[PDB]
């Protein structure tokens, strides 16, 4: 029953590729390529909902 309805309270600056998330009502793909040296932390893709505080 994989409708878990998880919500991720993450800061807008702590996430990676902030320019990838620009756009109103537009679907934006995001690769799960984890950069080991980037301070911008990768997401957990298989969370279902996200809050960008």
């Amino acid at each position: 029953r994989g409708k878990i309805c998880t919500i991720g309270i993450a800061p807008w600056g702590i996430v990676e590729n902030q320019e990838d998330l620009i756009g109103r009502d537009v679907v934006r793909p995001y690769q799960t390529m984890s950069n080991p040296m980037s301070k911008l932390t990768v997401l957990n893709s298989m969370h279902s909902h996200f809050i960008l505080a």
């Binding site: 793909p29 690769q31 799960t32 390529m33």
Partner: protein
């Protein structure tokens, strides 16, 4: 390769799909008879 991330959208750029049909480096296809038959009917 899609699990590591290959972006299957950006893979497809016309001529790459062109070599995908003309590749004989695999199992046999009936497509050699199909394209020949439709060229005969069109011409």
């Amino acid at each position: 390769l899609i699990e590591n991330g290959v972006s299957m959208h950006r893979f497809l750029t016309i001529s790459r799909l062109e070599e995908l049909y003309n590749t004989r480096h695999g199992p046999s296809n009936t497509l050699y008879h199909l394209v020949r038959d439709v060229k005969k009917r069109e011409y």
